[PDB]
Every structure is written in structure tokens, then in C-alpha cells.
Design a protein around this nucleic acid. Structure first.
Lengths: 228, 71, 49
RNA sequence: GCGGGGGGAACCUGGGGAACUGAAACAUCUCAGUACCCAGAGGAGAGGAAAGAGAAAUCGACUCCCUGAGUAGCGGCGAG
RNA sequence: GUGUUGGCUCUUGGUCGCGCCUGCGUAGGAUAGGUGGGAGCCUGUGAACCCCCGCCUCCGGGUGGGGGGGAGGCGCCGGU
RNA sequence: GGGCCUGACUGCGAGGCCUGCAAGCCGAGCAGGGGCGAAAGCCGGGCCUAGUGAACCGGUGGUCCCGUGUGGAAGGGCCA
RNA sequence: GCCCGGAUAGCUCAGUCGGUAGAGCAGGGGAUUGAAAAUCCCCGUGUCCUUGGUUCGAUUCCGAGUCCGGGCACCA
């Protein structure tokens, strides 16, 4: 009845009988973990879909405002003015088909790729073969291709966070900071709640949003009740 | 009479039959079985005061016996 | 049931016209043509099993 | 100290309840709930004040006559 | 099947809920079951050094515990 | 024998073949709409006379007509 | 017209809960061989029915297609 984690204390904080609610969550999590540096809490969940028959495969992004500064990097692939707009907006990786070429070579530091319709051909076909079934290639309704490179990367910084059910029907995303801002992580968690909810294909019958949670990169993993 | 119920009347009639179906499924009714029959309950008992019976019939029974059980 | 089976034409969700047809030689291959009452004539298409 | 029982041409209530013939065969169907066995109250019983009608912000117990269409319809939608 | 046709009981199967507690085609300090958060984590072991003991196996190893004490280890970093 | 293409079109037809019934059968020409020529025009299956079956019943693709107070609906009317 | 199973070596058929394709028989090759055998070693071939999506990859996982096998129900 004794286990291998010093986290054990934090675990004692952890009383898994209730599924509680959102704000409560902000508080008890913020309190729960501030180990090295300050917690990088995240939300994670699972939906009653079937990602094999891609007729439910979802992804995109809500706009959890915040202020922001951490999670899911993105590549702004375009040319001059777009590098301008998106880079400034809030980009982690920026350039164009030159960055695309660098990637074909041996540089890929961005989870999501957003390219403007000006270097989109080079991005998708040159880097198509590279970003591939990694989730790193641009798609016209996957919040990944279009001219508003600035607008989308912008929200990435004020604040981005995307969506993409993995193999078994689950998503992950940043919806509030540790010592946060908490309300922020909340709001973005939300925008995602919504756009996701919308995407919800009419091919669902029952408990659709099955598992919905916040988990970090290398860190904690706890479900969140996007209700409260 | 000598076998109705005791706690009311459940001793009589029955006209019936069948043949076959397949309606709001694929068609009309395989119609026919011009037949006739019986249709009834069962027997049992308890005690007045040292020495008794009941006889009666099924359900009506159960509630009833309960009743005079009250007395 | 023989290499003679009956199909019929329907057109781009805007109507359906009929007529039987076959099975033999080029089997499935089933676009064709025809014209529905959709609009004034229109492709149609055909296919429809 | 009471009651019944026993009758009764037809009418009458319920009890149980059939082939013909038709459907130019005939198995659903049909004659029909008809014939007949019965139990029983009458002088007539039957039914008899609405968890009704019907849709108009309408009627108003029950029974029998005329009408309601033989239309509304029931169906090897056929005899009927 | 179900109604009278009540009592205790040995037990065995399917199913879904959680745990393993678990996950070894191959380069992979290494038996990575995914997809999320994602460079930090922790000191009721004062430690990865050592000790046995509990448990699951495809040599290894993974995991859960009792102790033994003297700022240490690992995740990072990189790398496959 | 070669090219290009769907009319083996929907709406329909006047007026005739034969026939008592129902059948089956012949068809200029008007409309929408196309296709073969540049066009004078042919094309509403094949070179023609056999490859055929009422009525019920029920199915499906409509439609978006009907619904037994009203909204809908089981269900259902006409088309294919 | 529904409901289940399969599709693999020439034959009959195994087959990770995604990393290799394997039996049994047929066929062939040597030793043995009054002798037939049995013995006895050794091999041979695979879009794993087809088409796409999931995944770093997939015989396998899911959809769809064709085929064969099973079954169960009606039929004016």
C-alpha cells in the first residue's frame, strides 16, 4: 500500500473519488504542484469517436486568450510580410520554404505548421513527406493553412493551443498556467471546449466527449470537467 | 357450478387461433386457425381456528386470504 | 439473375429516371448520361443500383 | 318462524353453441352468434343519470321508430 | 418462460466498470501500450550505494515495500 | 469500315391497324432538351413479325397531398 | 432478402492484441536399400483476395469491393 513517488504528498492532496469541476481545479492544481520552476499543468480528455474511419478525426484550435507564453510550437511558413505578421503575432518557429528545406534536411522543432497560401505548396509537398503522419504538415481546415499566419500565430502567443485526437480518441491542450494566469488557462481550455464541441460530427451516439483533460508535456495528467 | 373461483368469477370461455404473420415486415397476414379452448387459475388453503381450508383461486386468493387473515 | 440484372439511372441527387439494362461485358462501368426533369434536361448521370 | 322449488304457445337475458348453400372449387370468409342443449328473472324483462357524445367555447339518462349512406368502411378488399 | 413451487449452500461462465497490476517485431544507456501537459523533480529512503523481501516475465527488466544514514541522483542536456 | 454521341428523352399526341371485352400495335406534328452535318434533316433503341403476364398483396427511390380536436406521427393518397 | 466465417505455399490450413509468415501433405534430392516400408537427414513458392485510411511502420486494425463458405426467414 506504499508506492514509488515522493509526489506521494501531492497524491495525498489527490483524493480521487470526485471529478469535481473546472475553477476548483484551477485552485487545487495550482496548489498541488510547483516543483522545479512552476507547474506546467495541462488538460487532457477522450471522446466516443472512432479515429480509424477519419470521419470524426478532429483538430483545429480555439483561442484561449493569454495572455500567453507556453505550449504547442508552430512553424509560420511563408515569405516577407507574413514572416512579419505571424512572427510578431506569436511564433516559436518562423520562416518559409527555406525553413521547409531546413526541415527536409534535419530541423523540425514545431508540432503544428501554419503556412500562408504563398509558400503552402513548398510546405505541403516538400515537407509533406517529412511532417507526414506526425501532425507537422499544413491542412486547409486544421488551423494550419491560410494567409492569417499572423492572426493564428498571434493567438498562439495571446495564445494558441490546438486540438488533435490521437490514435485512441483523446486530445491534449494548455488551458491555464500554474500560479495563474489560472483564469486564462481556463478561458483557452474553454475556446477549445467550444470549437471542439462544434467539430463534434453528427456521427456520434451518446457519451461523445468521453475523456477531457489537461496534462502537461513531461508532468502531471488530470481530467477536467469543462462543465464548471 | 362447482369450479369458478370463490373470490369472484374466473370460470369460462375462449375462442382463438392464428396461422401466421409477416405484416409491417414484408406483407399481409398468413391468416387462419379457426380454434376454441378453456383458460383458468389454481387452488390452495389455510385455517379458521384449528381445522380449515380455503379452496379458492389464484390471485384473488392471495390478496383475499390476506384479508380474512386480517379477519 | 443471369448476366442480365436490372439497374436504373438517377441523377446528381436532383431526380432519377429508370430503364433496366444488363450485366454482361463491361459489368459495373455505369456512368452513361440521360437527362432528368431536373432543370431543363441536365446530365443526370445514371448509375444507381 | 320463512324461501324455493313446479309450470307455461311467443316474446326475453345470459349461459354454450354447428354443417350446409355462397364465395359456380374452397381451406381465411359464409350463413352467424343463425338453428339447437341449458339456467333463469317476467308479465315483459333489456337497457336505464355519462372516466358518454362531439368539437360548436355543444350537447346532455335509458329504450324503440323514421333518417342517418348501405355511404363511413370490414375483407383469398373477392361473396359479401 | 412464468405463477403457486420456500431454505441454506459448493460453484462456474459472459459482460461492462477500474487495477495490474500489464504492454519486449527493430536502433533504441533501455520489455517507449498510446496520445496530452511537458525540464524539471525529492528528501517519514536523511540514499539510485548497498540489504533483503513482495510481484509480473521474451536472459535482461519493470514495479511495490522494510532497512541501512551523511548534498546525493535522476528526468533535463544529448541522444535512438 | 472509320468519327464524333445519347432521344434505348419527359410532356404528348391528331389520326388509323386489328379486337366485341381488355388487349397489343402504327404515328406526322406542337413544347421543353439536347446530338450527328455547315447545313437540306435523321434520333423519342435496335432491320422488321416471338424474349410476355391482370388484379390483389407488399418493397424501395419520391413526393411533400391526407391525417380521423391541433401541432407532429404511426400510418397513409399519386409518381417512379 | 438479413445474420455469422473465411481469402496465406500447388493442396489443407496456422498466425504478435501493429515489428517473423509458419506447420501438415503433395513435389524434388542423397544414404538405406533381396525389400517395401518405415526409418534418416535436405529443400522448394508466398501483393498473406483487392482498394484506400490509422501507424514510424501493419498478415494483423477499421471502411469499402468482389468471391466462396455457413446458416435463418419469406415468396403475390
Amino acid at each position: 500500500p506504499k508506492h514509488g513517488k515522493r509526489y506521494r504528498a501531492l497524491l495525498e492532496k489527490v483524493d480521487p473519488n470526485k471529478i469535481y469541476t473546472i475553477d476548483e481545479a484551477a485552485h487545487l492544481v495550482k496548489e498541488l504542484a510547483t516543483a522545479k520552476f512552476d507547474e506546467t499543468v495541462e488538460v487532457h480528455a477522450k471522446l466516443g469517436i472512432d479515429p480509424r474511419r477519419s470521419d470524426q478525426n478532429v483538430r483545429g484550435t480555439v483561442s484561449l486568450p493569454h495572455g500567453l507564453g507556453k505550449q504547442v510550437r508552430v512553424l509560420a511558413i511563408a515569405k516577407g510580410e507574413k514572416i512579419k505578421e505571424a512572427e510578431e503575432a506569436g511564433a516559436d518557429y518562423v520562416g518559409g520554404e527555406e525553413i521547409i528545406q531546413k526541415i527536409l534536411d534535419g530541423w523540425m522543432d514545431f508540432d503544428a505548421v501554419v503556412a500562408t497560401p504563398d509558400v503552402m505548396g513548398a510546405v505541403g509537398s516538400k515537407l509533406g513527406r517529412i511532417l507526414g503522419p506526425r501532425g507537422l504538415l499544413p491542412n486547409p481546415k486544421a488551423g494550419t493553412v491560410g494567409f492569417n499566419i499572423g492572426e493564428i500565430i498571434r493567438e498562439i502567443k495571446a495564445g494558441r493551443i490546438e486540438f488533435r485526437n490521437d490514435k485512441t480518441g483523446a486530445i491534449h491542450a494548455p488551458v491555464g498556467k500554474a500560479s495563474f494566469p489560472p483564469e486564462k488557462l481556463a478561458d483557452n481550455i474553454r475556446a477549445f471546449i467550444r470549437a471542439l464541441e462544434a467539430h463534434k460530427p453528427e456521427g456520434a451516439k451518446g457519451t461523445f466527449l468521453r475523456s477531457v483533460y489537461v496534462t502537461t508535456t513531461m508532468g502531471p495528467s488530470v481530467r477536467i470537467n469543462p462543465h464548471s | 357450478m362447482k369450479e369458478g373461483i370463490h373470490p369472484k368469477l374466473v370460470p369460462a370461455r375462449i375462442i382463438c387461433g392464428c396461422g401466421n404473420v409477416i405484416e409491417t415486415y414484408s406483407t399481409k397476414p398468413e391468416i387462419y386457425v379457426e380454434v376454441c379452448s378453456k383458460c383458468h387459475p389454481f387452488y390452495t388453503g389455510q385455517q379458521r381456528f384449528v381445522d380449515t381450508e380455503g379452496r379458492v383461486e389464484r390471485f384473488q386468493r392471495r390478496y383475499g386470504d390476506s384479508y380474512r387473515k386480517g379477519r | 439473375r443471369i448476366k442480365l440484372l436490372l439497374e436504373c439511372t438517377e441523377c446528381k441527387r436532383r431526380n432519377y429516371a429508370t430503364e433496366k439494362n444488363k450485366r454482361n461485358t463491361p459489368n459495373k462501368l455505369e456512368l452513361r448520361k440521360y437527362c432528368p426533369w431536373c432543370r431543363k434536361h441536365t446530365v443526370h448521370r445514371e448509375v444507381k443500383i
